[PDB]
Model the fold of this input.
Amino acid sequence: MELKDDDFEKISELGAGNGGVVFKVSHKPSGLVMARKLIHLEIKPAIRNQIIRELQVLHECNSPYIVGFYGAFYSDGEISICMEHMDGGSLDQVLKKAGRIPEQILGKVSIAVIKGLTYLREKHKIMHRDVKPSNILVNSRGEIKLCDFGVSGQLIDSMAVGTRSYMSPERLQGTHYSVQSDIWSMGLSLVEMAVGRYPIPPPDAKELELMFPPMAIFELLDYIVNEPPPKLPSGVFSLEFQDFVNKCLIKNPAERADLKQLMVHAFIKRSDAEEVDFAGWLCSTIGLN
Amino acid sequence: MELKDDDFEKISELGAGNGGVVFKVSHKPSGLVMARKLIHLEIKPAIRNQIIRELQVLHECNSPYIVGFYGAFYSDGEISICMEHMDGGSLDQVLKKAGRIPEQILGKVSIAVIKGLTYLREKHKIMHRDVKPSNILVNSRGEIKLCDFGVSGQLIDSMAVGTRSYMSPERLQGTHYSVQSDIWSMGLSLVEMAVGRYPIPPPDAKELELMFPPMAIFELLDYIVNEPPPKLPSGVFSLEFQDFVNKCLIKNPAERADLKQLMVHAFIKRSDAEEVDFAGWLCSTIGLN
Ligand SMILES: Nc1ncnc2c1ncn2[C@@H]1O[C@H](COP(=O)(O)OP(=O)(O)OP(=O)(O)O)[C@@H](O)[C@H]1O
Ligand SMILES: Nc1ncnc2c1ncn2[C@@H]1O[C@H](COP(=O)(O)OP(=O)(O)OP(=O)(O)O)[C@@H](O)[C@H]1O
Ligand SMILES: C#Cc1ccc(Nc2c(C(=O)NOCCO)ccc(F)c2F)c(F)c1
Ligand SMILES: C#Cc1ccc(Nc2c(C(=O)NOCCO)ccc(F)c2F)c(F)c1
Ligand SMILES: [Mg+2]
Ligand SMILES: [Mg+2]
Done:
């Protein structure tokens, strides 16, 4: 069925940031609860046709690790992307409440991210481009899915920050970046969720004991590309997880682990095995099910 | 009269970017054409009262060089700032069409900016914080006014980028910045409008002759704080304008010119004297009057 502006009805507001507003909506003719993302864009008719036509490939994006897509269209000054409503929200949202996402669970996250990235690369020849806790979605059925990946060249162009950056050193420095940049993003995301806060600058010997000031735009980006990469605090995380993130946060794109190598890493092998009630942990900490 | 959401009616859309949408609207009970800025904010009732109460000082901001303020209020997920409709739009908008704003005119711009900054500092003890071509507004009566200055501490907090930066070296580096940061912003704005493009990185010897690739976030900010400041191309601009911007773009906050010193600089003295049809030049280049 073809999606249309007058066929929708706002329920609530799921969040916003840097270009998009997403509402929990209801598709009147189908009865389906949906998440609708609106991106306000002052765009000429000809090249918003391109964006809509380019977003049609999302119909061919089927994977348990990728958010379902229903439709995309343009309506008076906004393009609409209609996707599956994830009732658990984003990992950045569950982190606020959790305070800290346990290593066991983060392993189930890593698996999903690595499988999601892999699907997009192998079957669609695209990198994600914006991997961060807010672009990773969860639900009550325990599914962990990626959204907001780069399907549309022209939409990337049309929008082209803040004070938190998950961009790789090579991407911050120039145009010489590619799929390996997503590994850094995942790597850094996993450290953040582990310790409970954005891991740059690293916490001091006192803050380390405490848990267990805001940085300026240049101070932050300078730290990323020049000062040694963030590490997982030792002792309280397994040597398996540590090696995983360390291999992820290698500054050099070519020295850095890839999806292939990460898929067969000790931590993932260990995480595939483990019997964990994700849905249980998720709903119990966010008060849902 | 007290401003209200149901009392307004959308005419057109004037623009958007990084938090705000501004519509040309009509205030039904007064008949006044207005510019209404909406800032979408997920904010607790208690601290959106603060923002609204803090924006009331804008009622006491009266100056020919500051955009008129009518009212501010909150309405279902957005705070509204209602200001004078400037029919000429922003300097960044007139630059697109002009291609280059003549030195003579930029002198009338400088005067307004320096008088606008001065008013805000002396009479209200506030710095602007976001001086750039888009925050400088013009109209058909030839008025040149500033908007989007920092009246509200809590609103600054609530919003706290892109790929063009007008932030001073000291502000990009830390919290050790103040009113002198606005001078850099003005300084850099004036170079941009003069030559026709954002002046970092500087144009090469070939591009200089031609007129008369996009930079990554770190490459750009690294250039600002480390590499020598931008200069006005010699020969085709007066020695008076050159010294003005040079004195504005001194990397050191304390070595940099202030509002006092700039007010009595040769270029402003010269610009105060000159008889220029701004309204004429403006309307003629943007097709209005
Ligand atoms: N399909 C969805 N299901 C449930 N919640 C969603 C969905 N899509 C987005 N959200 C929620 O809406 C919020 C806003 O997402 P949006 O993509 O607009 O910005 P963001 O990813 O949070 O941050 P940024 O703008 O910095 O990328 C997310 O944090 C998420 O909690
Ligand atoms: N009072 C006004 N009168 C006429 N036009 C306006 C007025 N206020 C804003 N505009 C127009 O709306 C546009 C959007 O302004 P807004 O403050 O939302 O973002 P911006 O200043 O353009 O860019 P940024 O978001 O990067 O600061 C401006 O470029 C300007 O042309
Ligand atoms: C399932 C699904 C799904 C995939 C992509 C986007 N959106 C985007 C975004 C995007 O949403 N970026 O983040 C917006 C705010 O940071 C950017 C470029 C692009 F081509 C897209 F298709 C989406 F919505 C949903
Ligand atoms: C006349 C007038 C006038 C003065 C200030 C703001 N707006 C702001 C902004 C603002 O608009 N920033 O830019 C928004 C997008 O970059 C930020 C902080 C603050 F306290 C304000 F009052 C405005 F609207 C109009
Ligand atoms: Mg997102
Ligand atoms: Mg503005």
Q: What stands out?
A: Residues B 134-135, 148 surround magnesium ion (ligand 6) (CB under 6 Å). Strands of chain A lie at 8-17, 20-27, 32-40, 69-75, 78-84, 89-90, 136-138, 144-146. Residues 87-289 of chain A form a domain with the Transferase(Phosphotransferase); domain 1 fold (CATH 1.10.510.10). Chain A touches chain B at residues 13, 15-16, 18, 21, 40, 42, 77, 160-163, 167, 171-175, 213, 216-219, 221-222, 225 (CB under 8 Å).
